Amino acid sequence: EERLETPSAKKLTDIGIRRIFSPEHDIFRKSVRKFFQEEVIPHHSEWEKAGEVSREVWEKAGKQGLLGVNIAEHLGGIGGDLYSAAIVWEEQAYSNCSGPGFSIHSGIVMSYITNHGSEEQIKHFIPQMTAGKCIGAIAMTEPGAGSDLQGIKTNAKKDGSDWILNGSKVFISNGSLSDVVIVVAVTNHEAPSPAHGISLFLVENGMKGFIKGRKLHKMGLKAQDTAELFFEDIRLPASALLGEENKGFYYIMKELPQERLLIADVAISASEFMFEETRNYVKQRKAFGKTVAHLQTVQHKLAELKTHICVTRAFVDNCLQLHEAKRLDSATACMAKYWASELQNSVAYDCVQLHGGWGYMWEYPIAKAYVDARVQPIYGGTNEIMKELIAREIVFDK
Amino acid sequence: EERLETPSAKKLTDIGIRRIFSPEHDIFRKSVRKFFQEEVIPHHSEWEKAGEVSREVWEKAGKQGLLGVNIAEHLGGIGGDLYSAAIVWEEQAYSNCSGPGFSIHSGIVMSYITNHGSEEQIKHFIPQMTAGKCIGAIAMTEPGAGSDLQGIKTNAKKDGSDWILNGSKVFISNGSLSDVVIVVAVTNHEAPSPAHGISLFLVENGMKGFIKGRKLHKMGLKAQDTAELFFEDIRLPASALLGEENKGFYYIMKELPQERLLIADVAISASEFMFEETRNYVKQRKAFGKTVAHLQTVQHKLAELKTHICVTRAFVDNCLQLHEAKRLDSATACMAKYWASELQNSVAYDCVQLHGGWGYMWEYPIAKAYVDARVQPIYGGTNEIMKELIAREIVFDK
Amino acid sequence: EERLETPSAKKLTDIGIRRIFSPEHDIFRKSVRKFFQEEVIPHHSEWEKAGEVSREVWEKAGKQGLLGVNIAEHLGGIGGDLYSAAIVWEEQAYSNCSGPGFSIHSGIVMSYITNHGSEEQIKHFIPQMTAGKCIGAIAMTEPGAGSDLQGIKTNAKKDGSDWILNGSKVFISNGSLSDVVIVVAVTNHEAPSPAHGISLFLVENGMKGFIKGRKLHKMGLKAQDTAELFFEDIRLPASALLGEENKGFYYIMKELPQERLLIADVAISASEFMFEETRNYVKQRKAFGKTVAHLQTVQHKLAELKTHICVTRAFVDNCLQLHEAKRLDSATACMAKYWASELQNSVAYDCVQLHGGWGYMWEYPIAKAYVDARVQPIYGGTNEIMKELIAREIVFDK
Amino acid sequence: EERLETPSAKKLTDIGIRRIFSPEHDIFRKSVRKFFQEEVIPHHSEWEKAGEVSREVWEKAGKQGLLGVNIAEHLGGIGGDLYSAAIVWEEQAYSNCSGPGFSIHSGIVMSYITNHGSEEQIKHFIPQMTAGKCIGAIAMTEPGAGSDLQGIKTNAKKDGSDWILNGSKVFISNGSLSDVVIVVAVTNHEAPSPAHGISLFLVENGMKGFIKGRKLHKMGLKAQDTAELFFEDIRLPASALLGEENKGFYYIMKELPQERLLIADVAISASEFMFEETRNYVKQRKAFGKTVAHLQTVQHKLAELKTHICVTRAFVDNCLQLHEAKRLDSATACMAKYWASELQNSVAYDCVQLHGGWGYMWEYPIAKAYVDARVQPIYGGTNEIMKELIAREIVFDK
Ligand SMILES: Cc1cc2nc3c(=O)[nH]c(=O)nc-3n(C[C@H](O)[C@H](O)[C@H](O)COP(=O)(O)OP(=O)(O)OC[C@H]3O[C@@H](n4cnc5c(N)ncnc54)[C@H](O)[C@@H]3O)c2cc1C
Ligand SMILES: Cc1cc2nc3c(=O)[nH]c(=O)nc-3n(C[C@H](O)[C@H](O)[C@H](O)COP(=O)(O)OP(=O)(O)OC[C@H]3O[C@@H](n4cnc5c(N)ncnc54)[C@H](O)[C@@H]3O)c2cc1C
Ligand SMILES: Cc1cc2nc3c(=O)[nH]c(=O)nc-3n(C[C@H](O)[C@H](O)[C@H](O)COP(=O)(O)OP(=O)(O)OC[C@H]3O[C@@H](n4cnc5c(N)ncnc54)[C@H](O)[C@@H]3O)c2cc1C
Ligand SMILES: Cc1cc2nc3c(=O)[nH]c(=O)nc-3n(C[C@H](O)[C@H](O)[C@H](O)COP(=O)(O)OP(=O)(O)OC[C@H]3O[C@@H](n4cnc5c(N)ncnc54)[C@H](O)[C@@H]3O)c2cc1C
């Protein structure tokens, strides 16, 4: 009826603001937020030391209806609009807890399985995934090839109705907890272009020859279980194949737009969270007989940060609106992923600076936020690549 | 029904794009775009030498219905909506012709008169204005005080029911071709703050005392007749007072947001032009066998500008929509003005650079768009002031 | 004895600072400064309206001992060291007067002739240039390419002992007042790579077929006469050929390091100028009960500008001490050229901002400085080419 | 002889380059680089798990002459000029091992003692600190005040010739290992400003009431034992007081230039390391049938980076030379600490990107460099306070 946009809101993270949301979305958001305050934030520090979140926190997120929110109810998901899905990405961001990998799981893997899987595959996976009993992961990057997809060597050869898979992936989110992993492999070692020789497989924990590697020591996402996967002559039945044979690259191209929107929103949300935290810190930090928020350099530094966050938010919210109507193209999503991910980092740099030396301490949220932010301009295709795609329609007009 | 957003358009300027416009608005845009291509661009380079546009080009746009577009029809205006008006700003910016002080005429002066004037004042001014016969300008800035209000000394003292006006003003747009000018003067040197002692006055070309000063020699807007004004003992009738006495600042407060949104739209629009003008140019510029557009670096710089231009566009239309609903608070207005004008300049700079040496010759459109862009971060309040304002809500909880 | 660096200096433009200079140089500098305040500044106002400067001031300069300074005395030059010629580039930059093409004339045109020329060409023109009678220039860029390295199409085919020249040039400094103009042509188009099919010819005002296009209308450098040059069939004796035939490129190469170190020192010197001009303005511009120089944001903006101008100056000074020792490679010089020139612009953008409206008036020195800085990033080889050149040793191992 | 400057050396880290060094300096540099490769690098990953290095590495360092390098030989140190002390800083920075607090020990603590101590204090400490058997630390910062000195609560009430020290410190380098701590306390509460009521005190491990707090958990400098200290009614003998009573501020001010120059060189050396580390990585990273270094963009990002590193190195070397001559003032020193440190982070960010996703893995050096670099723009005084000091000489006449 009379909803406010972020610039005008009391706090960038307030509830019931931004035009793309309805009052039902508001009610949902308040509960998702309660959920993070109570079931996630409290245990996060321990998962960090642990290297991954608990299955128990997944099992609950599912019983609560936070997993597979944009997945069709008649397909096994909870069945909400896109806006309801983003509320989950955003609220997780706002809790500044990066351990839970619900997004990779809910917004990516599940979409691949429902948008391109057999009636059987969907029936078998989707339900467990929504309940959080079956955690999802997707592995496409390899030691050698990450930006040059046309050069990844993981392969799958037919041996009757079966597919024998060999290879290894790296940097796989949820890699440790993963029960089902959508593996990207070369099936046609002789297609004209490697973009017509890739297939997708639903590999599972339990298959002989599926070896999960050591959990990666990173500078951020301390609670995210990023790991390596190895495949040693894994015999996959016919049903392991996700979608049509050799159509692998095609299914991907169609899902990337959403994988990037997801990142873009997460990053700008992260930015909003950092901004209210820091604004807070400097308004309570005594200095020179008053607070640091009284300093003009600080006042303008905060003005520049808020402006860039609201301006960008506007564009991401604009993108969410489009993807809901299924009119979000590759280039567009790319612009959101890239800018939002670069800003997230520039915001963090300045927000750690305003905390002074406490911003370097792990006990303060902003420290986590800073190293957590550096991954965003990298995965989902680096920003360099984002520009390649964006420039396509610019210089090589159809 | 269904429209594309700037990112996916074939050109950031095509008509029919942007979700905030109707099929009708496009017809009007097609026509205004037309007006500028024939009635303006051809003669602009000539007006540049003259230091001002012709009163003829003004009148044409008058009858053409390009003035007072957002001014209510029953008040002497063409009675359109905010968007229709925005179109006008945008098309002129797209023409790369900064001479016509059209925007300040329709968007600021006329709005001041209708929103705050009285019956005679409205029936005596608007028509001549909507007609393009009685040009307008607004003067506030002074030699010693722009960003400061306790710094202006232009004043008016009562003598019965008349007002004797004295002082000067500088940097006035349409200063030379103006017929009516809204002067800001002090009328109560006793008010605690100058915000309680300022009034608005409608001075008309021809009044004894009113003097048109030197046409300032600027670095850009070589066709805008930016001048200086003098008021030597002018006896103004009680009819000149616009609004209550000592309420002037309160009105200026209400109108600034529209001044800032305009400049913002004009700013980003100006960027949208430079992009295509530069995209196209480097696509056709032969070098090393192919064109310069085949250089990856040129491809990325190009992606960078488009992303920034598109992300800001989204925000500016966000602000047009809010203002159409008369729900655009000052802070948001300021963010628009500040970030858009700023972007405009780092875009104008890169675009020149991609135009190599020729981006330095006045023959090419970009060159002038560069020196024209530099004035945006300064008027309507310097970007520094914008930040002061946007920081108010961040730090001072009222 | 003791000497401070720019940071410690009272003003950045103080005489008697920077390790590389001696009292010897200091006396000559005060000597040169005087020349610019008394013989250049006074008339610049006018030359900007004539597009070109007076032929007289050039004779005054030369007679005075400014033209031909790094030019050895045994060949008709003042013979001073590099620091001496540097002092001339700098002082002019400090004068904010860009009309005089003194630097291209005695820093480039005179080196070429005396570095690869016959004892005839030397005796014949050097002395007349040093005197300020024969104004020199050089042309290599054409409307088709400035960076192609072969985009040059102006050819020079032999006909006995006298060469027949043919082609055209663009963006030529000292274009109109040019008595002599070195030209780069294709003497052996059959060459493996055109870096071997180029030669140099000393075109002289008067030769039949040597036409001079009119004054180019530029955005900045107003009193700098830049025009196009044509060659419609001129018979040139066996003397016009400078150095060897087809071994011409080797020359352009061996002198480029110096053209670029020149622009560098200029850029940073103009930057040292703008800083002090702007610091002066702020310290006296009243605002909010005290000077704008009392605002913390300004104080900080000023510190960023000083630090960069100081960090860089040091580098340019380092590049000077190296060049004085004939050991400044292409790469090092390019760096100084790339960074100095860019910095000059950012410094210019911020300096204008601190002047407010007034920074956009041709009245104020900073205004012309702004547009006169936009050319450095472009000429002497664009900053992009500077990057190509620096990248080589980085990536492609020698 | 013919020493080269960084822009022309094979590797910015090659020994034998940069003009401020001598053949004996290079001989020393090989010795130290070697020590870091043998005694430090190999054990660092374990010290990282521990949160502090071993005392063994210290006693080693001491024995091999790396501690107290620029301290007077007759005073207990090992004698030697600044350039030699700079090399120990730089080399450590080149080993990318921030664990050992050798610099804060030799570059700061020892200097405070040998510059203002007593013949008794000097004799009792330097010897043991040179042997690395007595590790020192500096403690000024307190939880509620790090920039505002007017707010440090640690105090010492005089009692006879005794001092009763109470209070606490936080963010203290070598805090855990610390054998001697230079604590800054308020000795005169009713003083005119707080800059006249501060004394320095030599607090030693073993003093009753000197409790070492816990090691702080940071985002970087994982092997640096940063802790918080407490002073509980410690009765310091009169020999505990360093220098004149209440003149503590004066000693600090005198030393600050060296502390900021040190942080600065450490920064630019880390950048030199990172650049070379990344250049190397892209040359060996195969992508698209070629390397990452074949892409034009990577080439320019590399040229840009190298240019800023070579330029900031030029300015930093100049500071060392100035400091060797004892003519390095506050401002110049802040200038280097502020810019070098910000650049270090900019450089670290782009080097992580160029490493793709591997730059986020702790296994890779560039990852340590990233978090390890974020601390420099903060300690030694924040970069904002740096600007404050630089901005002093600009706006307020001496
Ligand atoms: C913690 C973490 C989580 C991640 N999660 C997943 C996941 O779950 N599943 C998965 O498969 N991957 C994931 N990744 C990997 C990530 O998607 C890849 O790192 C990224 O897509 C490509 O980087 P790369 O590692 O392949 O490095 P490369 O691709 O070898 O190098 C990339 C860099 O090289 C340069 N570059 C590359 N191509 C170009 C170009 N064409 N033009 C200009 N420059 C170019 C730029 O520096 C670019 O950033 C994750 C990574 C991390 C670190
Ligand atoms: C081409 C052109 C057309 C214009 N048209 C009009 C017009 O038609 N009518 C009209 O009246 N005016 C107009 N102006 C004037 C313009 O609005 C003023 O320049 C502007 O409002 C204030 O700038 P100033 O020149 O007064 O600078 P000042 O106010 O003297 O100084 C401004 C600068 O000081 C510093 N500054 C000032 N205050 C702060 C602060 N609070 N915090 C941090 N920094 C601060 C910043 O450097 C800021 O940029 C125009 C100006 C130009 C150049
Ligand atoms: C006022 C003025 C004075 C000048 N004086 C002289 C003079 O005295 N004599 C003379 O001969 N010239 C002079 N010039 C011309 C100047 O040297 C050229 O403009 C400059 O070398 C750029 O070449 P260009 O103008 O042909 O632009 P182009 O080379 O056509 O375009 C340059 C742009 O294209 C892209 N680009 C080009 N090459 C590359 C690349 N290799 N890699 C990545 N990007 C690239 C970048 O955007 C680059 O900025 C002057 C120019 C001006 C305006
Ligand atoms: C790991 C590490 C090691 C360190 N080692 C030492 C050590 O050995 N000994 C020691 O005592 N300290 C050390 N420190 C502490 C460091 O020196 C201080 O944190 C720093 O000097 C001030 O930080 P603060 O948090 O107290 O600043 P705060 O006052 O909490 O906040 C500072 C920030 O507020 C703003 N601000 C503050 N003042 C102004 C101003 N006046 N004008 C404009 N903006 C301002 C800026 O954001 C400034 O950066 C170290 C810190 C860390 C993290």
Residue numbers in the entry:
A (entry chain D), B (entry chain A), C (entry chain B), D (entry chain C): 33 to 430
Published text:
LCAD substrate specificity overlaps those of VLCAD and MCAD, and in addition includes unsaturated and branched-chain substrates. Here we present the three-dimensional structure of human LCAD, revealing an unusually large substrate-binding cavity not previously reported in eucaryotic ACADs. The structural basis for the unique substrate binding cavity can be seen in the long E helix, where Pro132 is located in a position to cause unwinding of about two turns of the E helix, thus creating a large cavity.
Structures were obtained for wildtype LCAD complexed with and without acetoacetyl-CoA to 2.8 Å and 2.5 Å resolution, respectively. The first few residues at the N-terminus were not resolved in the wild type and E291Q structures. In the wild type structure, the chain starts at Glu34 (monomer A) or Leu36 (monomers B, C, and D). The C-terminal residue Lys430 is observed in all the monomers in the 2.8 Å structure of the wild type protein complexed with acetoacetyl-CoA, but not in the 2.5 Å wild type ligand-free and 2.0 Å (E291Q mutant) structures. The side chain of Tyr282 is rotated away from the conformation of the bound structure by approximately 125 degrees.
